[PDB]
Every structure is written in structure tokens, then in C-alpha cells.
Amino acid sequence: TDPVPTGGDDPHKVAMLGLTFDDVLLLPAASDVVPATADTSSQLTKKIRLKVPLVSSAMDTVTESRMAIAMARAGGMGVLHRNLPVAEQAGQVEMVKRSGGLLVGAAVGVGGDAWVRAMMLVDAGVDVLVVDTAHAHNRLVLDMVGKLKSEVGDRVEVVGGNVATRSAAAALVDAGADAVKVGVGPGSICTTRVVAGVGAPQITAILEAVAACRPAGVPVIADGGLQYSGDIAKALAAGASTAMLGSLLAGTAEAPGELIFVNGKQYKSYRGMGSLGAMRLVPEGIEGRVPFRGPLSSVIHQLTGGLRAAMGYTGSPTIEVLQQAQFVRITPAGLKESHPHDVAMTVEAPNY
Amino acid sequence: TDPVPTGGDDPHKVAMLGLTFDDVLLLPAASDVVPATADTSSQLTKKIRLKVPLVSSAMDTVTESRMAIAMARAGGMGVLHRNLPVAEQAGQVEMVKRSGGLLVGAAVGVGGDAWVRAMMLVDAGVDVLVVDTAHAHNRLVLDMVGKLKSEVGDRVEVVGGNVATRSAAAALVDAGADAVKVGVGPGSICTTRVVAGVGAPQITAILEAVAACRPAGVPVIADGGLQYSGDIAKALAAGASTAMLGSLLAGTAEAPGELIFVNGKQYKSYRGMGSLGAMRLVPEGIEGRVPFRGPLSSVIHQLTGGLRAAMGYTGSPTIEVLQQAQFVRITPAGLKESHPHDVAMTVEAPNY
Amino acid sequence: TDPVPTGGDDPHKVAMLGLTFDDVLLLPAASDVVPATADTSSQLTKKIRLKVPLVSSAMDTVTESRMAIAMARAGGMGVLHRNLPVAEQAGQVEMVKRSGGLLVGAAVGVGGDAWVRAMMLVDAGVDVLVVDTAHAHNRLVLDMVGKLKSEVGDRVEVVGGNVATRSAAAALVDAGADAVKVGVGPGSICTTRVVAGVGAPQITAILEAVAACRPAGVPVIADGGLQYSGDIAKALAAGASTAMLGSLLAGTAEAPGELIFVNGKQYKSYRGMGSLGAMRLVPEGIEGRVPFRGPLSSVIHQLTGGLRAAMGYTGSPTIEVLQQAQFVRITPAGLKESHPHDVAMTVEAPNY
Amino acid sequence: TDPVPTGGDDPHKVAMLGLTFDDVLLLPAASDVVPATADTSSQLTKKIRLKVPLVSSAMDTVTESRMAIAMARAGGMGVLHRNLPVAEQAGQVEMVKRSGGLLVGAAVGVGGDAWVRAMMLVDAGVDVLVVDTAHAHNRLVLDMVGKLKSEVGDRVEVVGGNVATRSAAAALVDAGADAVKVGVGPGSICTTRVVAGVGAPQITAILEAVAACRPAGVPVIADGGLQYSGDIAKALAAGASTAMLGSLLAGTAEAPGELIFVNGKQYKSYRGMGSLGAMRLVPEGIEGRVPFRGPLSSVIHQLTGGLRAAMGYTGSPTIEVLQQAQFVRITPAGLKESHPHDVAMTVEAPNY
Numbered sequence A, B, C, D: 001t002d003p004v005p006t007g008g009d010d011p012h013k014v015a016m017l018g019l020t021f022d023d024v025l026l027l028p029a030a031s032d033v034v035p036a037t038a039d040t041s042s043q044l045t046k047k048i049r050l051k052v053p054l055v056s057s058a059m060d061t062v063t064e065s066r067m068a069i070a071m072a073r074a075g076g077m078g079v080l081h082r083n084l085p086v087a088e089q090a091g092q093v094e095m096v097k098r099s100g101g102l103l104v105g106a107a108v109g110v111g112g113d114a115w116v117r118a119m120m121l122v123d124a125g126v127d128v129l130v131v132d133t134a135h136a137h138n139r140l141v142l143d144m145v146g147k148l149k150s151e152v153g154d155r156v157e158v159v160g161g162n163v164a165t166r167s168a169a170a171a172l173v174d175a176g177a178d179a180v181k182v183g184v185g186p187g188s189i190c191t192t193r194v195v196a197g198v199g200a201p202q203i204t205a206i207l208e209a210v211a212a213c214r215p216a217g218v219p220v221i222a223d224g225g226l227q228y229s230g231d232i233a234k235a236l237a238a239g240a241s242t243a244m245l246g247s248l249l250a251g252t253a254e255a256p257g258e259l260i261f262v263n264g265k266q267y268k269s270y271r272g273m274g275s276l277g278a279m280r281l282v283p284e285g286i287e288g289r290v291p292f293r294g295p296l297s298s299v300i301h302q303l304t305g306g307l308r309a310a311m312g313y314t315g316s317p318t319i320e321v322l323q324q325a326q327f328v329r330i331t332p333a334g335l336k337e338s339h340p341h342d343v344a345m346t347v348e349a350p351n352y
């Protein structure tokens, strides 16, 4: 009998061909939708629907109270990071709540200390707890999700992540998650794929997680690796209901951390929460910087405008229809035709 | 049952593998054709045949009256852009017509204002109306094409675009289009693929559109992404009847806009019509520059010479036979062998 | 009958599709393992188990006595290079042995002189002889392995390499090898693939060699091409039992050769043993430099920490379970998402 | 019925997947061959066997009399270029012949003038006429080959080229060619692939041509695109009997043209014969420069040493056995592992 053409005799050793955002384009389809008439609302969780299907990452260079307020006012939501004392994270929940009953989420880990944190976040009025771990396919993480759902699930929605497989998503669904957050390896500041050799290209990860979550009515949050507004449309078309953004929002005025003026231009610090600086285990993230991008409201407007254009091209009046769109797979040469090419760009563009 | 190897359980979610120009080469075949004896004529529309199968883009940095005159004199045609008052666009049609009864086209949009524009262009003597939209697979665009064909179709040919699928091309055929223009995403200055995440690699887009248009006897115009004279031959071999060029013609003396002398070299402005500067929706194009390339006549001579060489290699005495040629698909390493490699180029080449 | 789509009529002419480390990621799986509880021990040979599944290359810029001592103290092993007099190589074996009964290996070639070298290494107390050749699939190399096993195999373990195919691995198993070392072409300083045109991508090479060695109970050493700690996890998941490292260890304080201070930074010499400088046949290696990386102990800690993270993600409590993990194959775009992207890295990372 | 996944309904429109040298590696196999004992002799034509399976390109920056003499003395052969008067090309044939009865070839075109040239080359003592054209799959080229074979074929061997398909190779075999030269598009200075859009990746081109020529006993010359000594082994393994080199030999002392000292280093002019400068049709080649590489004899020694290493790895005692070797196909990531990587090269290598 002939070997598997990539080696050995086990056809399941190399189990899948993983596609990322740059591997696919959305195909145009028959459409009565124009960007103005598209409806961008979508479920964050079973019970919570957002006007704009975007949430900010639970990172100490992305989301504290000002980002959470701005995201909610723009129609999305912030997830407050957990790299700070319990009392301060709960205080920031209260700061968001005092700004008009805006929606807010907050991350917690797993274990006794994370439980105390979760309880004080609930008492502070948080709408969404995000059980936020590097590898959610673990009974301790599943136990955390289910125990939160058991004890405070009437009052608060409970998200679990992160996963990158159908079986891991199914495990979180069975534990009672109100949403499943997908992404192991794809983040712009993540080094898991080189440090551990572990990951899953995000379009395939979403397609697999959605195969478990969609039939259970559980929304999927696509988390990490989105670098363009078009990636939002691709993630939702692969079946996610919202996207979580770190890099694309770290450059905004509302993101915490230093505004850096270096060699005539403007940047802001952006670092993985598994980086050496954030943990102060070998690090699984880097510390870096992103270009300054101005007010959050303006960035969100550009991102949602790109999503609306995709809905016009695909004939999607709603995100639920966009989730039914088809991809074409592209080659490395198609990636060059898919970006502007063979021209020296001379003027600034707001979305490129 | 086993999942689709790229994810999920739907084998049609990723519907196609899209090839662009750089993914294929034309195979040599038995030939009695030399470049001198090839016949490059081809249908622009059902009724209009061009000596040279090339048209200039309807862009305000590519085609006003001087480009339209020069293109017609070279055996092709210009499509006058519509980013100017109706009276001025109609005036430029008259300027071309007063230069010897040369062929000319002009772009219009969709709606009442575009209708008034179309009527004055017809009164000015235009030969071809191009209903020119980002996404033609829309009943309003189809209605525009059919109503123009109904009211003025005896006097003028009516082109509709742009499309990137078989179903969208078929819809324009059924609406009565005299030609179908193909290209969503491929243009050198286009950012639709990153802003919206939408597009289709152009060789596959042409092959699919031709599968609908060729059996209906409707010519296909391949529009966008052509960067070399060899790309003209590839587009026609995939079944298109003409190619529309923006970047390759924007650098010519006849293209409107500024001749820029920067750091000792010469450039000209070239910008998407969906760029911020041209619209003055989030932009779907960039503003940039291309190297100055001299007189249009000389550029067209180089492009048609490359097409003639392809016809010699493929044994194609006519464009209709070139449309029957075969491709070989290449890998990323083949792309390096397909360009000149491992040599420092020391002398200027007119076509490279 | 139709040709093979890549050419000719022989479907076995292009026999395999070879994957390297960058072509695959490890998939997360259900896990009760955290990095702290993983057990990284693994068989170097049939009889020798290491606490850390790492050995240093038998190269004159990687392993002399200080590297061998440090590797053994860290839980792995050094293989002393053979580009020096027999008496000196045997002396370095004694130096390692006098430092606490640490494990040590030493390379030998093939023939009468290599036999004398092997005998004096055994008399000096060496634990592992490595019959170390460019192409082990040769009866002279197989004879060397079997004769060593026959004469001194009670006292010392005998490794043979290098191979890159199932049939070559099977030949070494039949000759009596206590381990099989895999890698033809992949080394960072190797030029065999361009000089001879010969090689095999290392993930496929390991999968094929393991298909012969694993059913015979013979451990596989993955040798060459590992550039990140995640590559260690990938090699072991493909079925190898240990990894051999040149580049990743050449930058350490214990590696022999010059510490180079050039343009404000620190490097160390690193050269192929088939390079012109090491042989003083056309060369099959280059002479170069790698960044200085500090003490070996610290490098090994970072590499094993990355391996432990992979074991946590894959649910592997032991290396034997990690050998059962699954890959996802990635595209060239996935390689960019798999490295940190779209951020200017501003702070040093210990493992990236 | 479902479309072809790359577009349209014709499964033969994209007829093949073309591999180039960088797409494949030779697999190691069981071997009693070492580089010293390999036999590199091979048929140039039906009647002519060379000690070294290498010929120099018929280019005015590669082969005049000094290169032809040096190539013959090294065991290969030169093909004198035809971009000079008939009397001078015939004179250079005589110059080679007066240097010890060395073998020599000379290029001719097609038509009456090429016939006069061929007759005077035969009278001057040439051993091989090379009917040398951009596209040999043409009855005029086939007629030239057959008429030369009819009139002078007792005295001289007749080669025809260039082709890139099985059908074109078969046509030259039927015309009576004593060898078939393969390569449309691959040359380092060639721009046919971008100017005309025409070509065929060279490994697939050789495999297809060999499928026609080998069963007829007609040797195949692999011409163009070879950039490393390992590419020689790959071309012969794909079934070619000799390789023709332009770039790799243009940098030698014996190549005609200027030795250029620019910014402290040494180069020599190298230009396509379809470049503007050589023709003084749109050009299908560029004018450039290559690094100076010293005496031809030394370059040939390095190239043949790499070929001998490949024969050792593949177990090929003769070129006829090397023609039976197998490839592994590699990915873009394998191309990086196949070159030296992640090391700053600090010392010159003679073959890299």
C-alpha cells in the first residue's frame, strides 16, 4: 500500500489544510444591498446583540475604561483586561456603567482567585464574563465556565476561550458557554506558533468551531489575526458572529499606554499579555508598537464601512446572510493582485 | 463523515480556486504564425470590432479626449471617464468625433442623473455607453443596461460591468448587454480586496464570465490587473475579447494629470476612482503615481508586439484562435523563473 | 492515457510532497497537561533515556567538552565532533567523564581510521558512538554500524546517520542501529540542496523514517533545520524521539570558536563540517556566524519551555503521547500569521 | 455539472501543473557510488558522447572560440553564436579545430541565409549544427532540420530547438533531429514569459519532451534556467542527457565581452540574444551583468563536482542511471530550508 504523499502511512497525521484570512476572498453575489442599507447587528452572546459586531481585546494596551466606553458608544463592546488588581478591574466596570448603562465585559482566568474576581465583577454590574485562557480545551476551564453559568448565569453572560478546533468548541458548548471565542496562535503579537509550534489558521479554525457552535445556537467570536476591515467580513462569512480586535484598536486615542513620537511619526505601545513585560513559563507574545490611528470612533467607522461594502458585494442585508457567503481560495500571486500593486502610493488613505 | 479538509462540512463554502495572471503561462503549440502575420482584431461589442483589442480605463488619470483620440488612432478605443460635468464629458465626445470619426466610449453610472448623462453622450455621437459600477450584479444596474438598450440601443452599443462570476455575467447577458466587463478587485489601485475582503482572481473570473457570455455571443472585456503585455495574451486566451488598461496607460503623455519630476525621474499621477481624492462610503482605491512611459502610440506598439509574439508561440492567426490556447499553471518558484532572474539589469528595455 | 499533471507518464517520478517545519502547526487537543507537569524525557537510543530530548551537533563550532558537559548537566547530551586527532577526541570524552559520570557521545566516520578512532573512544568511556556520514544508505556505512554493534555493542550504543527515506532508515535498523539519525539537506549551514540538488523536507523525512524505525522499536533523532523551540515539538510529533541542534546551540558560551563583536553586537562563528574551512570534493556547507545567545543552560531552558507549552496544548503528558499529535498544514499566508506580524517589535524576547 | 475548480467547464484549459528546478529535490537512494567513482559521460547527440554533460549557450556574451576551446578541453562543448558574419563564425570553427581536433557546435537560424551559413560551417569542420529558434514547433524549422539532415547529415549532427512540449519534441524527432533542445521561457535573461506570457516550467518541460524523445533514442538538451550545480543533476534526472548553460558560464574569463570593475567588485556583461542591444519585433531578453567567476575550467570543476555528489546520493554510477532518480516536490517553505538559512555567511564559497 502506498504512503500518504506527505509522509508515513497515517492519512490523519496531517489532519487538515488550514486557511487564514489572506488565503480567501469573498465572492460577489446577486445583491439588492448597498453599504447604506446593510444591517451590521449581530449576537455577541446568546442573549446580547450588538449594533456593530466588534469587541476590543482584553489586553492592557487595548481595553481599559475609556476604550470600553468608546466601544459601547460605537455599538460594539470592550472586554476589560485582567492584568490589574480585582478592585481596580471592578472599578473600571463601574466607570463604564456610570457612563450611561453601556454594555461591558471583563476577562477572568481559572481558579479560586479568578472566582473572587468574577464575583466582584458581577457585583460591579458587568454584563459579560470572559473566561480567557490560552487553551480552553481543559476540564478546569470547562468547570470554570459551567460553575459561573450555574452561580451567576441568570445575571451575566459567560464566554469561554480560546479554542481552535470543532471538538474544543463543542466542549465549551456542552459546558454551557453563551459564546465561544476562537483563536490559538493568530494574534499579531502572538509567538505561540513559533515558541510552541502550535496553532490553527483562523479561517479554518472558525469554520470548524462554527460547525460545533452554530447547530447549538452558540455565537462564535473570531479573536486574533484580523489586520484589515475586509478580514472582519471574512471572519463573519466563515460563520463567526463577532470579531475581537487587538492590533487594529491598539493604535487609538482610547487605548491605554504611551503615545510615542519617534522619528517624526506617532506610535503606541502594543504587547502580548503573554509577553515578558506583561507577565512582569517562557513568553508566548512580543512587546511592540503600532502606528497611531486617532479616535476610536473614526477607526470603527472605517472598519464598519468596509464590512458594509462586503455586505453590498455579497448581497447580505444582515450578518446572518453574510454568514452564508462563499469564498474563493487564492494563490500567493493572488495575494499580490489583492493588494494595491505596481504603484507608488503618494497620498494617505484612511482604511489602507 | 469527514470534514472538508479546509474546514467545516460544506464542500461549496470555499467554492473555487482562483487563478490570477501570474499563476499561468501560455503553452507553445504548433504554429505557422509569426508576429508579423498575426491578426490582432477582435470584437469590443457585438457590433464593434477593433484593430487592436485594447481599451483605456474610464478614469480621470487615464482617459480624457487626448487619450481617446490616441487610442482610436492606434486601433483601440478610449472610454471617457464620468468624474466631470455632463456637458464637459459630452464635449469631450465631440472633440474625439471632430478628429476623424474615431470610435469613442463613455462611462455612466445608474439612476436619473446617469440617464441624463447617457442621453447627452448619445446626442454628442458616442459609439459605446459603459454602465460602469463596482458591483453590476444588482437589478438597478441590470435595469439601466436594459433601458439604455431599449431606448438608444439602435444607435449605441451598451456595455455593463463589472462582474466576476458566471451568474453575474449571465445576468448582464439577459439584460441585453452588448459586452460584459470583468473585474472585481484586481485593479492596481484597487483596495476592495482589503477594505471589503471581496474579489476574484482575474483568470478564473474571466473563465467563469466567458462560460456565460461566449455561448451567448457576447464579448468579454477583461478589466484590471494587467501589468505586462503578456497579461493581455493571457486574458484573451482565457476567453476575453479585449482588455481594459489603467496602470499601463496612465504613464503616457496623453493620460491627463501632472507629469511629476521627482528625484531625477519622471512620474504621473494615477488614482483609483474610489479613492478619497477622486470622490472629492469608505474609499476602495488609492492615490499614487506610475513611471512616465512616453507617447501612447509607442506603449501600444510594445503591448501589441507582445501580444503578436504570444500569437506566434501559440499558433494563433487570430484572436479567436488565441481564445482556444492552453495554460500551464505555475508555482511560486515558477514565477521567479518566469521573470528575468539572477542578473543585474544594466540597460533599459522598452517592454520590461 | 493522460500524462501525470506535473509531466511525463510516470506517477512515481515525483514520488512525494515533502513538508518542512514551517509547513505545519500542531493542533490543540483535549488536555489535562500544563507546561509544569509535562514529562520531557525520551529515548536517545534503545538503552539510553534523556531527561531533555535534545543533543548538540557533532560540529567543531558546536560541541567540544564544555558543550558536552553543559548539555549532559541540562538533561540532554553532546556528540563530540571528529574534526581533530583521535587522541584529542578521546581526551575530551575523558574530560566529560571526569565531570560526574555525565553521558557523552562522539562521532566517527567509516573505514579503518574511523575504526581506530571508535576503539579509543570506547576505551575512553564514551556512551554513544555516532557513525556520522552525509549518506548512510551505503553498504560501507551499514557495515560500520553492524561491526561496531558486533564488537563493542555490549558496552556502547551505536547510532547511524544520516538518512531521509523509509528504505534508508530500514537498512540502518537491519544493520543493528540503536538509533537512526534523520536529515539530508535541512541544516542551516548546509548547501547540499543547491550543490547536489539533493534533499528531503524534514517533516516528511521524519515521518518516513519513523514508519521504518518505530515498528522496530528504534528511536529516531531529528537532525538539522530546527530554528525555533516549536520545531522541536513538531519533530517529536512527527515521530522522532530526540532532536539534534547545531545553529540553535552554536551561539552559546559553551560552543567552541570565537566570540565576535561586530558593529556593536555579538556573534559566534558557525560553519558546516562540509565547508571549505572545516575540510581544511566541492563543499556542501557554508561558513558563517550566529548571534550570541549566552549560557547553554538558559538556551536549553527556553527550548524546553517551548516544548512543554506544546505538550500542554496537545494534551501530551509524555513525549510518547506527543508523538501521536496531529498537524494542520498551512499555506504561505499562514506562515505570516504564524509569526508575529504588523507590529514593530521594540523589546527583546528570550525565545524570539 | 460542476465547473473546473479553477474556472470554466474545460478540464484541459489549464492543461498541466508546471514544476521548475526550485520545486523539486532529488531523493537519496541506496548507493555504492561516491563522487570520485561516478561516470559523468552522456550523449550530446545520437552519435556524440561528451565526458562532461555540459554545453555553453550560443550567445554573444557566452561562446566564441576561447569558450568553445575551453569547454571542449573540460570534456563538454561550446555552441558558437550566430550574431556575426558567416565568414567570422566559420573562422571561429576553424580556430577551435586547429586547437587539437576539439568538438565544436555552431548555431544557425532558418531560411536561405541560414542555409549558406550552415554550409560554410560544415566546410569549416563543425561537428554539430544547432538549428536555434525561439519556437521550433513550426514547419519551416522542421524543414530546416530535415534538409540539413538530408544534405549534410552523414558528416554533421543536427540539433533542433527550442521546444517545451511533448508534441513539439515529437515533431523534431520525426524531422530527424539528432537531439532536441528544451526551454521556452526559462532563461535568466529571458523576458518571453512577461512580454508574450508564454513559457513552460523547465522540469515539466523536460519530463514531457523526454516522454517523446527517450523512446525514440533522441537525447534531450536542457537549455536555460539552471542557476546552481544541483540544477544540472535535476535536469538530467528529469531525463535530459546534457544541460546548456548561459548565466553560469557568462561570468568566466573565456566568455566574450567586457570585464567590469564596478564599486570594488568584478562583473561581466551578459545579455539575451533577443535583447535590444543584441538585435542591434519587441525584445524578449534583457541586457545585464553577472559576477566574475574566474577561469572556465574552475567553474566546470565546481559544477561537475556538484553533479558527482548528486550521483553519490542517488546511487547513480552513470548519467543513464541518474535519469531514473526520483524527486520529492517541495513547498515555498521547503525552498528556504533548501538554501542555507538563519546564518550570516562570512566566508566565500566556491559553489555558493
Ligand SMILES: COc1cc([C@H](C)NC(=O)Nc2ccccc2)ccc1-c1cnco1
Pocket: A133, A134, A135, A273, A274, A275, A281, A282, A283, A284, A285, C033, C034, C035, C309, C310, C312, C313
Ligand atoms: C497571559 O496571557 C497568555 C499567557 C501565556 C503564557 C505565556 N503561556 C501559557 O499559559 N502556556 C500554556 C498554558 C497551558 C497550556 C498550554 C500552554 C500564553 C498566552 C496568553 C494569552 C493571552 N491571550 C491569549 O493568550
Ligand SMILES: COc1cc([C@H](C)NC(=O)Nc2ccccc2)ccc1-c1cnco1
Pocket: A033, A034, A035, A309, A310, A312, A313, B133, B134, B135, B273, B274, B275, B281, B282, B283, B284, B285
Ligand atoms: C467610483 O468608483 C468606485 C467607487 C467605489 C466606492 C468607494 N465603493 C462602492 O461603491 N462600494 C459598493 C457599492 C455598492 C455595492 C457594493 C460596494 C468603489 C469602486 C469604484 C470603482 C471604479 N472602477 C471600479 O470600481
Ligand SMILES: COc1cc([C@H](C)NC(=O)Nc2ccccc2)ccc1-c1cnco1
Pocket: C133, C134, C135, C273, C274, C275, C281, C282, C283, C284, C285, D033, D034, D035, D309, D310, D312, D313
Ligand atoms: C564532513 O561533513 C560533510 C562533508 C561533506 C562533503 C563535502 N560531501 C560529501 O561527502 N559528499 C558525498 C559523499 C558520498 C556520497 C554522496 C555525497 C558533506 C556533508 C558533510 C556533513 C556533515 N554533517 C552532515 O553532512
Ligand SMILES: COc1cc([C@H](C)NC(=O)Nc2ccccc2)ccc1-c1cnco1
Pocket: B033, B034, B035, B309, B310, B312, B313, D133, D134, D135, D273, D274, D275, D281, D282, D283, D284, D285
Ligand atoms: C534572437 O534570439 C531571440 C530573438 C527573439 C525575438 C525577440 N522574438 C521572436 O523571435 N519572437 C517570435 C518569433 C516567432 C514566433 C514566436 C515568437 C526571441 C528569442 C530569442 C532567443 C534566443 N535564444 C532563445 O530565444
Ligand SMILES: O=c1[nH]cnc2c1ncn2[C@@H]1O[C@H](COP(=O)(O)O)[C@@H](O)[C@H]1O
Pocket: A057, A058, A059, A162, A183, A185, A186, A187, A188, A189, A190, A191, A192, A223, A224, A225, A226, A244, A245, A246, A247, A248, A271, A272, A273, A274, A275, A284, A285, A286
Ligand atoms: O501574548 C499573547 N500570546 C498569544 N496571544 C495573545 C497574547 N496576547 C493577546 N493575545 C491574543 O491576541 C488577540 C489580538 O490579536 P490581534 O488583533 O491580531 O492583535 C487577543 O484578543 C488575544 O486573543
Ligand SMILES: O=c1[nH]cnc2c1ncn2[C@@H]1O[C@H](COP(=O)(O)O)[C@@H](O)[C@H]1O
Pocket: B057, B058, B059, B162, B183, B185, B186, B187, B188, B189, B190, B191, B192, B223, B224, B225, B226, B244, B245, B246, B247, B248, B271, B272, B273, B274, B275, B284, B285, B286
Ligand atoms: O478606486 C477604484 N477601486 C477599485 N477599482 C478601480 C478603482 N478605480 C478604477 N478601478 C478599476 O481598475 C481598473 C484599472 O486597473 P489597472 O489596469 O490594474 O490599473 C479600471 O479599469 C477599473 O475597473
Ligand SMILES: O=c1[nH]cnc2c1ncn2[C@@H]1O[C@H](COP(=O)(O)O)[C@@H](O)[C@H]1O
Pocket: C057, C058, C059, C162, C183, C185, C186, C187, C188, C189, C190, C191, C192, C223, C224, C225, C226, C244, C245, C246, C247, C248, C271, C272, C273, C274, C275, C284, C285, C286
Ligand atoms: O557542511 C555540512 N553540510 C551539510 N550538513 C551539515 C554540514 N555540517 C553539519 N551539517 C548537519 O547540519 C546539522 C545542524 O543543522 P542546524 O541545526 O539546522 O544548524 C548537523 O547536526 C549536521 O547533521
Ligand SMILES: O=c1[nH]cnc2c1ncn2[C@@H]1O[C@H](COP(=O)(O)O)[C@@H](O)[C@H]1O
Pocket: D057, D058, D059, D162, D183, D185, D186, D187, D188, D189, D190, D191, D192, D223, D224, D225, D226, D244, D245, D246, D247, D248, D271, D272, D273, D274, D275, D284, D285, D286
Ligand atoms: O533574449 C533571449 N530571450 C529568451 N531566451 C534567450 C535569449 N537569449 C538567450 N536565451 C536562452 O537562454 C539560455 C540561457 O539561459 P540561462 O542559462 O538561464 O542564462 C540560452 O541557452 C537560450 O536558450
